[PDB]
Design an enzyme around this catalytic site. Structure first.
Site, PDB file in Angstrom:
ATOM      1  N   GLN A 150       0.732  -1.331   0.038  1.00 25.12           N
ATOM      2  CA  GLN A 150      -0.092  -0.069   0.058  1.00 25.12           C
ATOM      3  C   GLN A 150       0.784   1.365   0.171  1.00 25.12           C
ATOM      4  OE1 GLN A 150      -2.943  -0.079   3.008  1.00 25.12           O
ATOM      5  NE2 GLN A 150      -4.037   1.810   2.383  1.00 25.12           N
ATOM      6  N   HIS A 174      -8.414  -1.130   9.418  1.00 24.53           N
ATOM      7  CA  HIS A 174      -7.462  -1.603   8.375  1.00 24.53           C
ATOM      8  C   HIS A 174      -7.844  -2.911   8.206  1.00 24.53           C
ATOM      9  CE1 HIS A 174      -3.892  -1.281   6.039  1.00 24.53           C
ATOM     10  NE2 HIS A 174      -3.423  -2.311   6.520  1.00 24.53           N
ATOM     11  N   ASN A 222      -1.048  -8.057   6.424  1.00 29.09           N
ATOM     12  CA  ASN A 222      -1.272  -6.481   6.313  1.00 29.09           C
ATOM     13  C   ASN A 222      -0.760  -6.180   4.851  1.00 29.09           C
ATOM     14  OD1 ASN A 222      -1.154  -3.831   6.683  1.00 29.09           O
ATOM     15  ND2 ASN A 222       0.071  -3.779   8.620  1.00 29.09           N
ATOM     16  N   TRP A 271       0.010  -3.439   4.019  1.00 23.38           N
ATOM     17  CA  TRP A 271       1.323  -2.500   4.183  1.00 23.38           C
ATOM     18  C   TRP A 271       2.341  -2.927   3.588  1.00 23.38           C
ATOM     19  CZ3 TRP A 271       0.730   0.301   9.628  1.00 23.38           C
ATOM     20  CH2 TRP A 271      -0.635   1.278   9.530  1.00 23.38           C
TER      21      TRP A 271
END
Ligand SMILES: [Ca+2]
Ligand SMILES: [Ca+2]
Length: 322
Positions: free
Chosen positions: A77, A240, A264, A266
């Site tokens: 991300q 999230h 995640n 991220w």
């Protein structure tokens, strides 16, 4: 076979560009402020300040479409709140046939390059072929939005671009960790579970969903925006979306323990509790189970026990196919 988004024909546009010795420039999605966004990524926003649109072939001498497969590690991300979409794309890579629909694998920067790529997106309740030119937002020499851990890999940046395109802007991909204002990603039925009040056989539900190639995501809920994307003590992110990427039972201290794996989007920041990369729970499983399931790396991916999972996360979403 697949409908052409806006009537744009990839192969027809590709050869036209090749034969005229030129690079494709998409009229349907120009490299322009409005394509970025409308508010947080809006006109003159400080977030968009210093953004330029550059092809990978301008950035590097060796740009690649796919490097060591199109995999979940390729989804990191950027500066855009599109965590639900990015989590779904990460889950989509686990489904081999669906992945090879969405991401046509033939494409590269080497032979017959015309600055154009295409993807098959689920839109209007069917498969839709979407072209993009390969101009991408760059800031400080780097991609602004999704990037791969491999710096010269571009399939995911381009895939996120195709989604931005069909929604009219990148900011339009932003929002919440749920399918809020996002149309069918998959088309099949979506299952929703509140984890505290789940069916007793939820673990088996998750397991069978993964086996058949459904897409699973989960999140922790919030009320105010002061605790939005707030990091937990054991390093979970609130509000999230995470991909649910695996589920395995282990023999832990002689007892069957159900485990759940998540990523995640991220591509970093991971749970630090029981069953984390460096936790001691792994010293009490069969060494061969350990070696097989545990990966010690800051990659956004980690294991939790299913019990700690349903305690920590508020909801699970399952997106089924057709
Ligand atoms: Ca890759
Ligand atoms: Ca990890």
């Amino acid at each position: 076979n697949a409908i052409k988004y806006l009537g744009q024909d990839y192969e027809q546009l590709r050869v036209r560009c090749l034969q005229s010795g030129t690079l494709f420039r998409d009229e349907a999605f120009p490299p322009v402020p409005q394509s970025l966004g409308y508010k947080d990524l809006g006109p003159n926003s400080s977030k968009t300040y210093g953004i330029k649109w550059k092809r990978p072939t301008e950035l590097l001498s060796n740009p690649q479409f796919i490097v060591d497969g199109a995999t979940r590690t390729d989804i990191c991300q950027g500066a855009l709140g599109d965590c639900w979409l990015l989590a779904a794309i990460a889950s989509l890579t686990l489904n081999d046939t669906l992945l090879h629909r969405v991401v046509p694998h033939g494409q590269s920067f080497q032979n017959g390059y015309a600055g154009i790529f295409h993807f098959q997106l689920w839109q209007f309740g069917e498969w839709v072929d979407v072209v993009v030119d390969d101009l991408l937002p760059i800031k400080d020499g780097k991609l602004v939005f999704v990037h791969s851990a491999e710096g010269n890999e571009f399939w995911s940046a381009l895939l996120e671009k195709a989604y931005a395109k069909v929604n009219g802007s990148y900011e339009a991909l932003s929002g919440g960790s749920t399918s809020e204002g996002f149309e069918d990603f998959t088309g099949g039925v979506t299952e929703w579970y509140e984890l505290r009040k789940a069916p007793s056989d939820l673990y088996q539900i998750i397991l069978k969903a993964l086996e058949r190639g459904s897409l699973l995501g989960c999140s922790i809920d919030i009320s105010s925006v002061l605790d939005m994307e707030a990091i937990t003590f054991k390093k979970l992110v609130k509000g999230h979306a995470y991909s649910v990427t695996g589920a395995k039972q282990v023999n832990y201290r002689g007892q069957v323990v159900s485990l759940i794996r998540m990523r995640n989007p991220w591509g970093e920041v991971e749970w630090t509790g029981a069953w984390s990369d460096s936790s001691s729970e792994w010293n009490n499983v069969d060494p061969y189970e350990r070696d097989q399931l545990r990966v010690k790396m800051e990659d956004g991916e980690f294991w939790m026990s299913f019990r700690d999972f349903m305690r920590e996360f508020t909801r699970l979403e399952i997106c089924n196919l057709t």
